[PDB]
Design a protein around this ligand. Structure first.
Ligand SMILES: Nc1nc2c(ncn2[C@@H]2O[C@H](COP(=O)(O)OP(=O)(O)O)[C@@H](O)[C@H]2O)c(=O)[nH]1
Ligand SMILES: Nc1nc2c(ncn2[C@@H]2O[C@H](COP(=O)(O)OP(=O)(O)O)[C@@H](O)[C@H]2O)c(=O)[nH]1
Ligand SMILES: [Mg+2]
Lengths: 478, 478
């Protein structure tokens, strides 16, 4: 069928575009297919391994430098050696964690494309199964949910997971270990690699919070991948004659490594299912063409936002949580330590000043290293907005306080006497002595509120109709 | 001097506690110390290489199973082989990436402790310089800065970095690569180990946004680590006769590994400096035990705001960014769809409910897989608080607007009634219908606000002063 593999999706400066020359060939296949992807760290031998999957010497380019060689996703359509009527599709993948590119965002995109387009997903790692490998694999599986949610109608996304024959939809999982050298023992009893992986995904007793954080990744991985597997391979050669592996035959390699490669290939051939979409329809060439088009567009067409390409970004989100905590801490000392109404504007100035000389250092204690004090000035703006909100709350609370104090000391001594008492010949002469020598003098009771001083002026501007009015001229009549 | 190592900080159930048996022997040593600390991926040979630093076969316990063996931090004190009067203190720390333990919180704490206590830091890795290794190393670098901010007074943290002879404070860096297999080549030109390290730490051209994301880890690494070096080591044994390595002489090992380990040991002995605190003070026994104590209490004294366990959870916290996007869309709709003093309150509530439905459909379109709908209910509470904010905004808006209307349609009337032809009997016979005439003409005037009738009622209860006085005056006129 295909003499050589050709690039399916390109990767130029962080963009992903479906390759029309690969789409043209892909559209020409009508049989249902079996797809076998792969992912793994960069310079790990992924291309060398998928050469054995095709079973042909010479294939995906290997390379032997410290630079990454395989870029983008490369397909290779071959007839299935063990299942008649179906076409085996091998996908090669750009290595994870490249230092020359230094971009985790594109890494996760290629990872997600591999798992989504795969009906048999293969992970690659060196030495041991690792917590970092678990976190990266776990993080991808939910990103796969994000991608499908933007291009799939219903029947398997976030509404119905089990009891829908979904075990044929999600890809079967395989974990490969490279250059395994440790003895397969744990707690005393030896372990088969299947038992090793299951122990790595073994749940933890009960339900604490640190136990839930432990259990959460393993549970999600178990749900995502119905069937799981694990393999181990020794070093292909004893010394480092590792640049001539494209030219070396099987006898020069370690016989155990050849046996393990044959076992892995036999497992894949005899247990890989046919890729199917939601609904059980077997996926063929044109279906794959539309699938890769939709997924590539879903990645590079606006939506699907992921900011994995940093650690400072998530640290700054935690720092935003610290802004929330500092706001709570500031509100605690501004609500419980000090009262609701006020005494003087300078008093509130100093009060907010010391509350800030607490909150800012609380921020810096619970914070992270922020660039150019961007988040620091964001907290400053947030605290300024909160200070303005508290000043409005002060101008409202002190307004109510002054109105109520007038209604409780001034009104009960003015309204009850403004009816008939001030009809006497000279009520104003003693009303001034009443007001300006008792009411204003007692108004100096603490918690006046300097923002409510103008309310006194408004009240006087409202009282001019009984200061001199209501016939303050009865002396002339008498 | 010392026959064997001992634990310095025990790590039990994720808790770090200083070991008094180790603090006691620390307290009895007076000579200055050079401290070499190691970290790396778990089950890699950290303990094996630190055995070669002391140059004694059998030492730090190795462990040859797939389970982690070295737990916590283990200290060893020896006389300095090449610096008379100094003492070499080796710190072997628990490896990162444990699957049985499965907690990135504790691994980061152990990492940070090793960096802080080290006068010479050794990062151990497998295969190649790795972007994940840079991502973790960068994350640690900020972590050590923050930890020092909780136990160091001044002169070195966040205020004065350069031009303070700080090159002695921050530890030198050695990146050791294990089981190196690739040829040393890049862009066609061969590379030395240090050239490889600086090429992986080579910054990129100019100023884009992604390029700053690229440059950010490398800038921090090259800043906080003054002197950098890299070393490569081949496989110690051709076959995997690797479980009896502590019983193995140098003859049966590959001579290249012995040569590289000798060069690395020579570099360490001839270039590692005495540990210097802030200000240049050399470290001794009491100072090192004081450092250990204060850093242990710094870690275990409620100063743990930085976490990276379940990185998908932090990617979920980007639903907060989705919340901000929904809030931006909601506020834009309020600014454009509805005018600021909306019609009464029922229309406000209905349009707000429709806009909240639009906001929630935007939220479900953008976000995904809410954990027990926690972010859903937090967005509901945020929009509830925003409804309260728009409610007081409409309250003030109605206050301003109805005040403006009443003043523009009442002030000539209130001026002409204070000084006019209303003193004569029958003058109020025109006002007694005109006040409700004005009220009804306002009622016909649109765009009231929720507090329209209430505000007019307060105006009435504040404006019987210019009714009753002249009402009584009219009685005298009659
Ligand atoms: N560490 C390791 N390297 C291998 C193994 N098998 C082959 N290699 C070498 O790894 C080198 C790079 O692999 P490469 O094809 O670049 O993988 P890719 O970059 O992920 O596509 C090849 O030159 C192989 O010689 C293995 O099992 N372990
Ligand atoms: N991959 C690798 N393993 C080694 C090397 N040297 C020793 N080992 C083995 O790796 C294990 C050492 O792990 P260890 O030193 O305990 O790391 P730790 O488990 O974190 O303390 C032992 O089995 C050693 O025999 C090496 O150069 N490369
Ligand atoms: Mg490749």
């Amino acid at each position: 069928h295909m003499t050589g593999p050709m690039c399916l999706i390109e990767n130029t400066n962080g963009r992903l575009m479906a390759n029309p020359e690969a789409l043209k060939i892909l559209s020409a296949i009508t049989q249902p297919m079996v797809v076998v992807a792969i992912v793994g760290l960069y310079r790990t031998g992924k291309s060398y391994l998928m050469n054995k999957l095709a079973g042909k010497k010479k294939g995906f380019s290997l390379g032997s430098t410290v630079q990454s060689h395989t870029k983008g996703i490369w397909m290779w359509c071959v007839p299935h050696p063990k299942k008649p009527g179906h076409i085996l599709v091998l996908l090669d993948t750009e290595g994870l964690g490249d230092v020359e590119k230094g971009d985790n965002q594109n890494d996760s995109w290629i990872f997600a494309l591999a798992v989504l387009l795969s009906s048999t997903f293969v992970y690659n790692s060196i030495g041991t199964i690792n917590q970092q490998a678990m976190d990266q694999l776990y993080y991808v599986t939910e990103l796969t949910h994000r991608i499908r949610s933007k291009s799939s109608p219903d029947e398997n996304e976030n509404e119905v997971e089990d009891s829908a024959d979904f075990v044929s939809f999600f890809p079967d999982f395989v974990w490969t270990l490279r250059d395994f050298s440790l003895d397969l023992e744990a707690d005393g009893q030896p372990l088969t690699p299947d038992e090793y992986l299951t122990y790595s995904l073994k749940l933890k007793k009960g339900t604490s919070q640190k136990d839930e954080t432990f259990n959460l990744p393993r549970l999600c991985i178990r749900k995502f991948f119905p069937k799981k597997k694990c393999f181990v391979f020794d070093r292909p050669v004893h010394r480092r004659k590792l640049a001539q592996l494209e030219k070396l035959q099987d006898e020069e390699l370690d016989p155990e490594f050849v046996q393990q490669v044959a076992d892995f290939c036999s497992y894949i051939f005899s247990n890989s299912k046919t890729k199917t979409l939601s609904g059980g329809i077997q996926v063929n060439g044109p279906r794959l063409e539309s699938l890769v088009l939709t997924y590539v567009n879903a990645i590079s067409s606006g939506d699907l936002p992921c900011m994995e390409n940093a650690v400072l970004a998530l640290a700054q989100i935690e720092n935003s949580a610290a802004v929330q905590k500092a706001i709570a801490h500031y509100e605690q000392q501004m609500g419980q330590k000090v009262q609701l109404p006020t005494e003087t504007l300078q008093e509130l100035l100093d009060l907010h000043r010391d509350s800030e000389r607490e909150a800012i250092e609380v921020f810096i204690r619970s914070s992270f290293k922020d660039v150019d004090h961007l988040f620091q000035k964001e907290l400053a703006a947030q605290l300024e907005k909160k200070r303005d909100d508290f000043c409005k709350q002060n101008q409202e609370a002190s307004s109510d306080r002054c109105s109520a104090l007038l209604q409780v000391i001034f009104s009960p001594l003015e309204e009850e006497v403004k009816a008939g008492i001030y009809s006497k010949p000279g009520g104003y002469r003693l009303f001034v002595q009443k007001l300006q020598d008792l009411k204003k003098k007692y108004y100096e009771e603490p918690r006046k509120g300097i923002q409510a001083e103008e309310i006194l002026q408004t009240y006087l501007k409202s009282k001019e109709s009984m200061t001199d009015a209501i016939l303050q001229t009865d002396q002339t009549l008498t």
